[PDB]
Structures are given as structure tokens and as C-alpha cells.
Amino acid sequence: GSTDSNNGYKELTMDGKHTVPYTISVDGITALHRTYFVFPENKKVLYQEIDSKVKNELASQRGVTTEKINNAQTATYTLTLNDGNKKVVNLKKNDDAKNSIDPSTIKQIQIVVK
């Protein structure tokens, strides 16, 4: 078991773009069409501003609307920064819906509703 210590080899994985894998859980089940997202750097945005556009994307694949999510028993997602930090917040209660953040610090996120 030996890995590169200095150099390795050339790579072309969305070089220049910020990729961020997204996950979701339903009743304990894991998504099957999981994928990654891309966004610009050095830019701030409102959590509610983005989520508003994301909800329309997840509602089309999950079929869950603002009325359905309300019927859910629980809704929480964990956020993972690029530094390796972790913060789980309930979707039902947007505490950052009135805050500004950038994807440049976002590494990955996993939603959990049931």
C-alpha cells in the first residue's frame, strides 16, 4: 500500500470548476440518481435564493412539494465544508435562509427526510 508522495500523473476532472456531490435519504433509503453540482467562485448567495431554485429541481425528481415536505416527520441535511467541517441543520427551519454564503467553501451535503 503505497501512494504518491510528491507527484503522480495528469488529470482532467472538471478542472477549473467547483464540483460538489449531493446526497439524499428517504425513510432510510439512499438516492440512486445521485450526482454532483457546479458553481462559480468568489460569489455570495442567499440560502433561500438557491434552495428556491433547487427545490424545483428535487421536487421534479422526488415529486415532493412544499406541501408534502410539511407532512414529513423530519427534515435535516448535513453540510460539509472544504476544510472538513460538519454542520447539520433542519430544512423545515431555515436559519441561514437570510444569510449569504459561497460554494467555494462548500464540499458536499446530504439531505435526510422521512
Residue 109: name the closest of 83, 87, 92, 94 by CA: 87
DSSP sequence for 42-71: S--EEHHHHHHHHHHHHHHHH---HHHHHH
Cell of 41: 467562485
Q: Assign a CATH topology to domain 18-113.
A: Ubiquitin-like (UB roll) (3.10.20)
Q: Residue 49's Cα: distance from chain center in Å?
A: 14
* CA distance linking residue 63 with residue 49, whole number of Å: 20
Instruction: Return d(Cα 68, Cα 50) in angstroms, integer.
Output: 20
Question: Can you tell me the distance from the alpha carbon of 101 to that of 103, in angstroms, rounded to the nearest whole number?
Answer: 7
Taking the CA atoms of the chain, what radius of gyration do you get in angstroms?
A: 16
- Distance of alpha carbon 89 from alpha carbon 77, whole angstroms: 6
Write down the domain spans for the chain.
Answer: 18-113
